[PDB]
Amino acid sequence: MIQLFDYYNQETQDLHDSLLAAGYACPTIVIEANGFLPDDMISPYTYFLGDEEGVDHPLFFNQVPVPPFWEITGDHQVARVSDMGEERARIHYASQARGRLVKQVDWLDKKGQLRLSERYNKQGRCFAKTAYKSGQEAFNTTYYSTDGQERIVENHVTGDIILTLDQEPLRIFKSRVDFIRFFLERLDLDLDHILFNSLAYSFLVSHSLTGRAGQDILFWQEPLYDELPGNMQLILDNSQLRTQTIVIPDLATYEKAMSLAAADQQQKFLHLGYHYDFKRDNYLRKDALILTHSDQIEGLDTLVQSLPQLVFRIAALTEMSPKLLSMLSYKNVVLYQNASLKQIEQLYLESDIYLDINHGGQVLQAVRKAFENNLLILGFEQTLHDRHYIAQQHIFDSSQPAQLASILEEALCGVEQMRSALQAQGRHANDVPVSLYQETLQSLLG
């Protein structure tokens, strides 16, 4: 009875939640070295360090300890430290939406090459150092106690691990997987059934546990192209193995899956989705939004004169280019600038419509925050990532005729109109009711 997740990304968390609403609360294990973990879940690296639980206080880019008088810089994309103006440290910001929160800090040699990497948690002090050899090759990663007494030392080359716990004999493992099994035997978890999202080590622990009592399920997510991986068809031509069933939430994959290897495998290909948590309803206001890291936004000059009924809110906390300020002379359009990390969501509160015509990088995972807030997503072939949550019917041509997107969006002036138009976009990402999870996952221990 375990959630085993190899890496953390938002594409994982959507599994944690869908099972949570479907009523599976079982212990959760993460292979990755992440320190920002939402406290519902633990990792074999972070358990034995000894920091506290329920404390979210990262370090601010200016706080990272540095030698006397040495000068810190940060731009809200990255941060840097310079002895006499010369680059020494790189600081990378957390995956977190909040700007200027410290995840990893890399130091460079006198020649600019990478040497040391000191990772940071969500609790605000350095919990691991990573070392590099020569050509920027990974060497080892040291893990520290709270006091800094050595606890975990992993040698990336061989794969061996050193465990010196507090006032504890020294064990030396061999492979990453052997350590994982030691972490499920140290906590005495219910191993009745195990859930995992990848063909990586998380999958491998299922292969190491092959004899043990239980059956296991793989939720496969990552996209497929022309052939199934060899570690995948391994469950299809073998029987005994702990994992007996493959669940694919995205249908575009579930359709291509049964489309390769013939005969029986279509039994152990099931189909599900992710029951989300929507944060609010639509309300059908006339107010819209586009988020832009890069001026400009194609097709734009057309659509403003096209529907004077409505208002365009487009912004960057970056400095605005003077070419987009010329559009302001059309007074249906307001421009926001240099937005508070609570004032970005001011637009996501008062906008019901988001349009990916942006040409540059999605900022702050813009498409996704619109989806959770139900903002109807409409765009072109020049849309952004992730294009996961957008229905094909709402996708349109790249700079080519843009007013089909108008009179089709204009068609949502009624409540029944928006509701029916959302559900297409709703089930693009395979939103399902919590009922479907009860049925499909009732077949195993409940």
């Binding site: 206080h57 006499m84 421009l335």
Partner: protein, 503 residues
């Protein structure tokens, strides 16, 4: 002892940060405390000195970083046109001129001189360039003698600066620097060598031989911030914050996003012995923000960055219904909207003037505005000139600036008594206007949407011109000008100095 003041650079048109030093200089001249104003930037386009004297400085008060190493000390350019052409072999016949430029010709071997005059009608020469065969091989800069020389060479059919050099009065080599693509690299002194301009300032401060009670004052961090701190802890150090000091927008109660100009000092504040701002309003905000966030309690004073020698009365007839504005003339000042408020005020009250004094960004797209808009000769874009009595000759003042730490242009306006119209924001706007008397403050939605702000602007403009308040709120501006006056400005300083020398 002495008081050293660190500022990067200066132009003719230089910012109010730079003017603050100038005002601050004449202050110290009357407290019997000597000082020096250091300048790190590369100053070539004109002579360093004409910029110094221009803003009110005295020549012997300025230490130019690239100067002080030599014996030649700062001074106006005394070199005649005839003095240079006497330094050349042969003689010319054909001679051109345009603007500040003179070009002599000796084209038996293909060579000539492009000369640069300090100003047109005079014969004094700032720059002298030499071009043989059509390539530039040397360029000499002047004050009373040759105080530096640049050498060049072609690359991809372009003039390319490779090495510079500096000289003494005897024409001896102090140091020459090498140039790789617009950035200095190495400095050859006979006794030393250096690979970074940061570590050159380290040598400059080091040779200044600071004593226990000496004072180093930081204005601009950029690029020198680190090298200032390390080598100043011998003496007492201080940093004065001229602009707004953080971003309230991206700040939670947990996190405070500072301003890059001052960040390195706030993080490391402990090493600094004192801090300075101008409005005590700013003090209590920051100093409270200071302890709630990083829990550091440095000594912070309150001093105005420009004063009144005396408050001015404009004897000559009070010019009717006049407006005036001045600033860096940039995006931040939002001069655009002032141009929008007047042509419609040109309606109910014609003839009323407005004058724009400044040199900077987008002066052009302003001049592109009035030609087409409804002011033919209704507005004056006059550049940047001396306003010493000029404010006094105009009826009202306008600032559309969104934030100002002091905003001296209206500090010099309340010495003319003039009424004021602007936004209600920290700091200088929430200092120099109490809406009941003198001027008017406008609350502002946090947004820029044209229709809202410009229309409310003249709402309180015409309640003045017509009528009854333009006479007596000119005196209240005077009675609040009494608050910041040199007698008080000189006062806070003199004590604060030995307040640090206490220990």
């Amino acid at each position: 002892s002495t008081v050293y003041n660190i500022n990067l650079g200066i132009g003719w048109a230089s910012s109010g940060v730079e003017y603050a030093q100038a005002y601050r200089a004449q202050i110290l001249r009357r407290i019997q405390q000597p000082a020096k104003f250091i300048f790190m930037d590369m100053i070539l386009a004109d002579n360093i000195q004409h910029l110094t004297e221009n803003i009110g400085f005295l020549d012997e008060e300025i230490i130019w970083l690239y100067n002080y190493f030599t014996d030649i000390k700062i001074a106006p350019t005394t070199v005649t046109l005839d003095q240079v052409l006497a330094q050349v072999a042969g003689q010319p016949e054909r001679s051109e001129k345009e603007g500040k430029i003179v070009r002599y010709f000796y084209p038996q071997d293909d060579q000539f001189i492009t000369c640069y005059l300090r100003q047109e009608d005079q014969d004094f020469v700032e720059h002298v360039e030499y071009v043989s065969r059509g390539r530039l091989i040397r360029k000499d800069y002047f004050s009373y003698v040759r105080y530096a020389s640049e050498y060049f060479a072609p690359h991809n059919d372009a003039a390319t600066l490779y090495q510079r050099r500096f000289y003494h009065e005897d024409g001896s080599v102090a140091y020459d620097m090498l140039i790789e693509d617009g950035q200095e690299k190495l400095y050859r002194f006979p006794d030393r060598i250096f690979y970074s301009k940061a570590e050159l300032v380290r040598y400059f401060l080091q040779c200044l031989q600071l004593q226990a009670d000496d004072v180093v004052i930081l204005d601009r961090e950029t690029g020198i911030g680190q090298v200032v701190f390390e080598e100043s802890q011998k003496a007492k150090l201080g940093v004065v914050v001229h602009a707004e000091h953080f971003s309230e927008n991206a700040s939670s109660d947990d996190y405070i996003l500072w301003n890059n100009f001052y960040d390195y000092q706030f993080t490391n504040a402990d090493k600094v012995d004192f801090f300075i701002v101008a409005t005590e309003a700013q003090k209590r905000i920051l100093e409270q923000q200071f302890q709630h966030y990083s829990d550091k309690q440095p000594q912070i004073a309150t001093i105005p960055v420009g004063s009144l020698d005396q408050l001015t009365y404009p004897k000559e007839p009070r010019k009717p219904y006049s407006m005036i504005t001045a600033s860096r003339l940039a995006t931040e000042k939002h001069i655009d909207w002032l141009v929008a408020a007047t042509v419609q005020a040109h309606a109910q009250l014609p003839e009323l003037t407005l004058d724009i004094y400044g040199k900077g960004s987008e002066e052009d797209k302003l001049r592109r505005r009035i030609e087409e808009a409804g002011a033919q000769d209704y507005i004056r874009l006059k550049g940047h000139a001396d306003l010493s009595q000029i404010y006094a000759g105009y009826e009202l003042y306008l600032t559309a600036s969104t934030s100002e730490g002091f905003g001296l242009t209206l500090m010099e306006a309340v010495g003319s008594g003039l009424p004021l119209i602007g936004f209600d924001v920290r700091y200088g706007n929430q200092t120099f206007i109490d809406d009941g008397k003198n001027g008017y403050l406008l609350p502002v939605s946090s947004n820029h949407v044209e229709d809202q702000i410009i229309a409310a602007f003249v709402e309180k403009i015409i309640a003045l011109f017509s009528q009854g308040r333009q006479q007596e709120m000119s005196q209240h501006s005077y009675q609040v000008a009494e608050n910041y006056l040199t007698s008080r400005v000189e006062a806070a300083w003199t004590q604060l100095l030995k307040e640090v020398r206490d220990d």
